[PDB]
A paper describes a structure:
We focused our attention on human RAD51, an ATP-dependent recombinase crucial for homologous recombination (HR) and for error-free repair of DNA double-strand breaks. We therefore explored the possibility of using a more stable orthologue as a surrogate and focused our efforts on archeal RadA from Pyrococcus furiosus, a protein that was already structurally characterised and is closely related to human RAD51. Here, we describe the complete process of generating robust, RAD51-like surrogate systems from this archeal protein via two distinct approaches: by stepwise mutation of the surface of the RadA to humanise the BRC4 binding area (HumRadA series of mutants) and by generating an archeal/human chimera (ChimRAD51) in which all of the BRC4 binding part of RAD51 is stabilised by parts of RadA.
The structure of HumRadA2 also highlighted the need to introduce further mutations at the back of the Phe pocket (particularly V232Y216) in order to force I169M158 and K221M210 into the same conformation as observed in the HsRAD51:BRC4 complex. Proper humanisation of the Phe pocket also required the removal of an insertion that lies just before V232216 (residues L226–P231). Overall, the structures of the humanised RadA proteins are very similar to each other, and significant differences can only be seen in loops that are involved in either crystal packing, or are mobile and poorly defined.
Residue numbers in the entry: 108 to 226, 232 to 286, 301 to 349
The structure:
Amino acid sequence: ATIGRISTGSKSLDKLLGGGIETQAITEVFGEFGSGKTQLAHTLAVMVQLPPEEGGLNGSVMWIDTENTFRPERIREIAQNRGLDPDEVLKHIAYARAFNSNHQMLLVQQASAMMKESRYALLIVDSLTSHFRSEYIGRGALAERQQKLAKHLADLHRLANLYDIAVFVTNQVQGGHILAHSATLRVYLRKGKGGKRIARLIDAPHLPEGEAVFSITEKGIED
């Protein structure tokens, strides 16, 4: 992984992303359940804690959970298989459930208070859209749903830039999922076979089209 970025754990996925995930930016990963999107989030929550030589930023994590995504048992396994102390890794993941889209937005707006006293380098939102989709139903509420989501993405981008944090969010295709303003780096995941998952990058403004295969292992993800 390159200077100032966080390695995903997979050398081929890092290459596809131009050297790993960036701070001061939003990486948005699309896929169905089983595609590896949440496995990648769990892996990043450990990788960011590593020193720069090993692909991290010695940073803490904030995890905003909108649908029971976070598995501390998985973090413990990944940490153990990457030579880290699992209890220390968990102590540096600030977990917060978001009960609705308003609460999800407020959690982001209030997050920087805890960032002056500890060095955070990663904010995960898993998932970005589940509350927005369940709360704003039909054509009569669609414009408001997209405006609210765009405002949330602007808040995340501001936080990312002010505190030098990588923002990593998950999503699902449906064109319900496309916004008028492109606030993120979009990565599309799909499930393969034999432990493999495939990532595709198709419309990045400063990265060419590409694809990468990675594996789900006891180390989280790797080639």
